[PDB]
């Protein structure tokens, strides 16, 4: 199954007490597939509030997402953790469910050496037999991997490439030059145009949950060399993103889902659970200006 | 029970497969009480490899530590997590076991606002009824809290004070000036002396597992104003600490315990699980030079 | 005079004792005009080793460069300094010589407030009557300016826009969206393609002194939407740039000029004055692979 | 001449047009010697607004300060610069004037290598014959030097030691341990007591221009092991420093001088030249509360 193209980092619907809302999660899945027209979903990432949840809740989300999506789209499962044993258990579970690849954040909190990081990736690959996408988010992790270190990771033939979330476009270009057959997915929705200009293979993003029509246009127009039109759409996109960021990233994408009839629910504590009223009204203005 | 003074951040003995070795953990607890002469233990911290473990393994460690220590010393339970529900569970369990206070790292990975951080501490306190020590480790977390924000936290009368792990001695002074009745424990063993000189009430540290004799000397000498002698002992301490850092922090402490007949075991993956033989030889030298 | 397009940040030829070599400086100017075919020169920038020079040497350089260039190309004079009186004197001097615009790095070393920064720019403009390009280099200065702050600066109608040297392509897009009539010059040669893709009006770079042919191709092909060809040329460019960076930035561009008969001379202490022999040999290899 | 103890980093009196006010500079010098009772002055440092001035103005300040001080106190001349030639010129001039040591900030703006930094210090020393104090201000410079690199610097017997301005108390202890006969001056007035507790030999500070009496008490009491009394005075000191930082550092110290009849003048552009009237009223309050 082809892993190129547009992937929404799946948001999860929670109840007021923080439990999974299965019905709302299925609506979010459906909405991405049928209305956003994504190539795939990236499940259990930062956007899914993954790192605030129990092992059992993560399994529950993997199960529901796969069940609802079936085989209509590609699915990637993020299974990384500071706990390698949890990561292996999640990796085997997602592999058994039929996820097309695994993905794993570089281990965080502690300051791990590069050979520890490589051993972590190799252990998950070995225990699962599945493909791996290296998940690079230096602004959250403080972890910075170079071209040579990426080459050492790529010695494992099950490693397909990297979800690139740093804003280093020098490194991005260097990685594409050095490993032309390895894949890169851009992680930053608001920099999609420059990233596609350097030949990334795809994008994984939180805003595609509500703006997937514009995201695909930016990406495909860029790759066809229609820059003038891609740029205009990127501009409107970034007006939307700038508002969503100022209003509260995850809550505001959820409120934009709710405004389209999707039961996207609350956020999970310790994140703020629901918008204040004025921030509800602000989300409505964003809906009216950009998504109507 | 008095929470002032010298607290070892408890190391945990693991088997080759990463399971807890109960017999070893009990030897480590017994050695801190009987040989290091600590005032208490801080259990489930960074030092105990906490964030690489399952919830069940965390509970197991709390239980064992408490069972072995009984009521001879004070015990503090670190129950913080990106998962607030897990933090509440562990907080209730440790409270039922009779830990004298909880502690909790500020939630991490995601970028939480300060009112989220305050709500997180307030929720743990309300659900457990226990005391709370705010756990500040900016070099691992990327989280920086100010004097005013500490004031907001301290509006909850069950918040006793802070485990201070930043090296900002201006902030440390400002906090003691503003909240003279709240407690500060120094978190950096190699800066014990300047921290004690500013009136911190205790220290919580990984190296006190093998250097607890000198740590108590530095701390009590400094508070008595014997700076000349405190400094000499800090100098030797930091020769030892420099060596430990260079050889691998957790593994070298465990090697140093092993050399005194404590079965301190392996470290937990994804950390390197055991020292290479030259690193074992290096640890023997530190032993011969500083702890014989 | 039109300030769009390709500007080399002018390197300066120094003698062994650090004095300016006027014959060499003239050769570097002539080479840029006739062989690199640049639209202009940006004189007195970082690349010119400007900050290691006295006010007299700076004046000497402005006059030689203008005298040699005459009116064949556009010229911009970087006159910024921690000393505002020096910046004014240089700004008047360069204006009198007929430079087409001034430019000034944000004041550095001290932490200036934004209103101090704005006042600095307004003072230089008022004293000289000339146009001003805001010079933004956060990796050298530690200074970060936002979209709103750029808008306050742009209230002065003599401010033309900004030499952008941060790698923040979100900010770059947001600046183009907000102030569509103000100009942006990219400052990072190795990210020229992504920057052009977002509509920048030009580039100012150290490497255009030797690679100005490829630099113009990347820029013009990108603007025409020929991304596939622009990317190939950016790849080869970045092979050259990676080698130049590893070998020593300014020294290696000078050595690559020398290999084309230009007496680009020494660097100025406290920079290392000349390459070691092996680094000379390395620059020869770069010349053979990329510039023959 | 003995270079231990308490040094005010000397403020400079400017007129409304930025020229040096000689009469005012002399009043500041006199006030530090007679009223603050300092062991010496550190002239041409960050506090003296040095880096905003021309070479001639710097010379003028060295000459005036030395003339006014004569031989009553120790004098250190800061002569560092991104321009090594200006550094050598100023170093020779100050040496000829009879300054007891030079000092030079690590070269900044460009990212110099360590061998370049060492060659810079060695050149200044060789051209002047004078002593050198290495001036370490990482929060302004972005430059971080380690224990081994300080040892390489100290191979030059004319390098006396270091003005320490990082808040890294581990590095401070390590430097005293490794080079017990080399001197350290604390750079951070608000961290005086913990620095003195680690055996620093002296302190160089901006606030000693108005709080010299307290600064000497903190330092001498700490060295005598009267920590309880030292801490009280550090507390009051840091209430004053906090106010001064909030209100505007250099302008508020000058306002505090003016309230004692010292004509401390304006600040030099591009710093804000004078306080607003509410900030004047604020400074009067600091004077009433802490310096009456």
Read off φ and ψ for residue C43, nearest 5 degrees.
-110, 135
Interface check for B82 against chain A (CB to CB < 8 A): the answer is: yes
Q: Is D52 part of the contact surface with chain B (CB cutoff 8 Å)?
A: no
Whether C123 and D51 lie within 8 Å, measured CB to CB:
no
Separation of alpha carbons C91 and C85, rounded Å: 10
Contact between B174 and D242 using a beta-carbon 8 Å cutoff: yes
- Annotated active-site residue in D163, D254, D258, D287: D163
CB-side neighbour CA atoms (13 Å) of C71: 2
Cis-peptide, bond into residue A285, ω within 30° of zero: no
CA-based R_g, chain C, Å = 18
Query: What amino acid positions of C are annotated as catalytic residues?
Result: 135, 163
Using the structure block, give the residue that is written with the tokens 């002399």. Answer: D26
- Give the mutation candidate from C55, C266, C270 for the D interface (greatest D CB count, under 10 A): C270
The resolution, in Å, is 2.1
Chain B CB within 8 Å of residue D238 CB: yes
Question: What residue of C is the nearest CA neighbor of A173?
Answer: C235
Q: Is C110–D84 a contact, with Cβ atoms under 8 angstroms apart?
A: no
Dist. CA C74–CA C99, nearest whole Å: 8
D107 chain-C contacts, CB cut-off 8 A: 270
- Residue D197 known to bind ligand: no
Task: Say whether residue C166 is in contact with chain A using an 8 A CB cutoff.
Answer: no
* CA dihedral for B96, B98, B101, B104, sign (positive or negative): negative
Judge whether A174 is closer than 8 Å to chain C, CB to CB: yes
What are the CA-CA distances from residue D147 to residues A203, B242, D228 (Å)? 45, 12, 32
C166 prior amide bond cis, ω within 30: no
The SS3 call for residue D40 is strand
Of D18, D119, D140, the CB nearest to C85: D18
Buried b / exposed e along C73-108 (16+ C-beta atoms within 10 A): bbbbbbbbbbbbbbbbbbbbbbbebebbbbbbbbbb
Catalytic residue among B93, B120, B121, B135: B135
Alpha-carbon gap, residue C68 to C34, rounded angstroms: 12
Pick the CATH number of B1-292 from 3.30.70.1560, 3.40.50.300, 3.90.650.10, 3.20.20.70: 3.20.20.70
Residue of C148, C168, C169, C193 best to disrupt the A interface, most CBs of A under 10 A: C169
Question: CB within 8 A of C46, min separation 6: which ones?
Answer: C9, C105, C137, C140, C206, D109, D110
User: How deeply is A243 buried, as exposed, middle or buried, from its count of CB atoms within 10 A (0-12, 13-18, 19+)?
Assistant: middle
Touching subunits of C (3+ CB pairs, under 8 Å) are: A, D
| DSSP-assigned states of every residue in A58-91 | HHHHHHHHHHHHTTSSEEEEE---S-HHHHHHHH
- Does A31 belong to an annotated binding site? no
* Nearest of B194, B195, B240, B188 to residue B214 by alpha carbon: B240
Q: Which residue pairs, CB below 8 angstroms and at least 24 apart, start in B122-126?
A: B122/B156, B123/A269, B123/A270, B123/B84, B123/B88, B124/B79, B124/B84, B124/B87, B124/B88, B124/B91, B125/B156, B125/B158, B125/B159
- Would you say B131 is a known binding-site residue? no
Residue C283, chain D, CB below 8 Å: the answer is: no
Comparing CA positions, the residue from C286, C171, C181 lying closest to residue C238 is C286
Contact D128, D160 (CB under 8 A): no
Domain ranges in chain A are: 1-292
- Chain B within 8 Å of A97 (Cβ-Cβ)? no
Residue that has been written with the tokens 């509260």 in this structure: A248
Residues of C in contact with A199 (CB under 8 A): 227, 231
- The CA-CA-CA angle for residues C45, C148, A272, to 5°, reads 125
Say if CB C134 and CB C153 are below 8 A apart: yes
- Of residues D46, D111, D270, nearest to C84 (C-beta): D270
Contact between D225 and B226 using a beta-carbon 8 Å cutoff: yes
**Three-state SS letters, B149-201:** HHHHHCCCCCEEEEEECCCCHHHHHHHHHHCCCCEEEECCHHHHHHHHHCCCC
Q: Are C7 and C41 in contact (CB under 8 A)?
A: yes
Query: How many CB contacts within 8 angstroms connect chain B with chain D?
Result: 81
Q: Which helix (H) or strand (E) holds A136?
A: strand A132-136
Q: Is A249 within 8 Å of chain C by CB?
A: no
Query: Which chains contact D through at least 3 pairs of Cβ atoms less than 8 Å apart?
Result: B, C
Counting Cβ atoms within 10 Å, is residue B281 exposed (0-12), middle (13-18) or buried (19+)? exposed
What DSSP state is assigned to residue B14?
B
* CA–CA dist C123, D273 (Å, integer): 14
- Establish whether A265 is an annotated binding residue: no
How many CA atoms lie within 13 Å of A18's alpha carbon, on the beta-carbon side? 16
Identify whether the C-beta of residue A65 lies closer than 8 Å to the C-beta of residue A43: yes
A–D contact: 3+ Cβ pairs < 8 A? no
SS3 A160: strand
User: The tokens of C40 are what?
Assistant: 């202009």
Residue A47 annotated as part of some ligand binding site? yes
Helix (H, G, I), strand (E, B), or coil: what is residue D188?
coil
CB count in 10 Å sphere of residue D119: 17
- Give the span between the Cα atoms of B265 and B254, in whole angstroms: 7
Nearest CA in chain B to A112: B271
Instruction: Report the distance separating Cα C272 and Cα B202, nearest Å.
Output: 50
Q: Which of B58, B66, B118, B163 is catalytic?
A: B163
Asked if residues B245 and B72 have their Cβ atoms less than 8 Å apart, the reply is no
In chain D, the DSSP E strands lie at 5-9, 40-43, 74-78, 101-105, 132-136, 159-164, 183-186, 202-205
Phi/psi region, residue B70 (left: phi>0; alpha: psi -120 to 50; beta: rest), is left
User: Does residue B200 contact residue B182 with C-beta atoms inside 8 Å?
Assistant: no
Question: B-chain residues within 8 Å CB-CB of A271?
Answer: 110, 112, 116
């Amino acid at each position: 199954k082809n892993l190129k193209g547009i992937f929404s980092a799946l948001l999860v619907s929670f109840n007021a007490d923080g439990s999974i809302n299965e019905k709302g999660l299925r609506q979010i899945v459906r909405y991405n597939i049928d209305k956003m027209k994504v190539d795939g979903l990236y499940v259990g990432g930062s956007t899914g509030e993954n790192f605030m949840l129990s092992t059992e809740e993560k399994k529950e989300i993997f199960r529901i997402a796969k069940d609802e999506a079936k085989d209509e789209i590609a699915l990637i499962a993020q299974v990384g953790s500071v706990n390698l044993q949890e990561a292996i258990e999640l990796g085997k579970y997602a592999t058994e469910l039929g996820y097309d690849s695994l993905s794993a954040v570089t281990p965080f909190y502690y300051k791990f050496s590069f050979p520890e990081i490589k051993h972590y990736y190799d252990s998950i690959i070995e225990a699962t037999g599945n493909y791996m996408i290296v998940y690079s988010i230096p602004f959250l992790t403080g972890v910075n991997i170079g071209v040579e270190q990426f080459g050492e990771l790529y010695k494992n033939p099950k490693v397909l490439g990297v979800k690139f979330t740093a804003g280093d476009f020098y490194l991005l270009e260097r990685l594409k030059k050095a490993y032309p057959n390895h894949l890169i997915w851009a992680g930053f929705d608001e920099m999609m145009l420059p990233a596609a200009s350097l030949g990334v293979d795809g994008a994984i993003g939180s805003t595609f949950n509500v703006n997937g029509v514009r995201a695909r246009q930016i990406f495909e127009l860029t790759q066809a060399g229609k820059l003038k039109e891609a740029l205009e759409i990127q501009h409107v996109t970034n007006d939307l993103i700038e508002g969503i960021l100022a209003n509260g990233l995850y809550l505001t994408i959820k409120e934009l889902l709710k405004l389209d009839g999707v039961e996207a629910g609350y956020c999970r504590e310790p994140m703020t659970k629901e918008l204040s009223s004025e921030k509800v009204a602000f989300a409505k203005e964003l809906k009216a200006k950009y998504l109507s």
